[PDB]
Amino acid sequence: MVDFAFELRKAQDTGKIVMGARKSIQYAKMGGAKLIIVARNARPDIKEDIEYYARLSGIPVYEFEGTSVELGTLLGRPHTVSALAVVDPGESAILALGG
């Protein structure tokens, strides 16, 4: 089974992830992300925009069970992270979350 925290960090360290709604949308429009992860408390309209642009490109979206605080903490940040895009999974199995 995917250990979310482990594989997310492994993606961050060995691949390429980009943090935040703005960047997540940009990558979604260009079809540049392989997965978008949204915190469960991401702003409703932002979550909906992400889901929309991801759907246009066939990019899977995964909702993280925790808050933007918990997601930021997982990513080593002292601030909230509401969404992120996995551009390159590196050596990780994070993309299995796309189903």
3-state secondary structure the chain: CCCHHHHHHHHHHHCEEEECHHHHHHHHHHCCCCEEEEECCCCHHHHHHHHHHHHHHCCCEEEECCCHHHHHHHCCCCCCCCEEEEEECCCCCHHHHHC
Domain tally, the chain: 1
Amino acid at 52: Y
- Cα distance between residue 77 and residue 91, in whole Å: 22
CATH (domain of 84): 3.30.1330.30
Q: State which approach was used to obtain the coordinates.
A: X-ray
Decide if 87 contacts 32 (C-beta within 8 A). yes
Strand duo 35-39 + 83-88: pairing: antiparallel
Which domain covers residue 56, as residue numbers? Answer: 1-99
Q: Give the closest residue to 72 by CA, choosing from 83, 80, 64.
A: 80
Decide if 17 contacts 95 (C-beta within 8 A). no
Angle between helices 44-57 and 21-30 (to 10 degrees): 20
Resolution of the experimental model, in Å, one decimal: 1.8
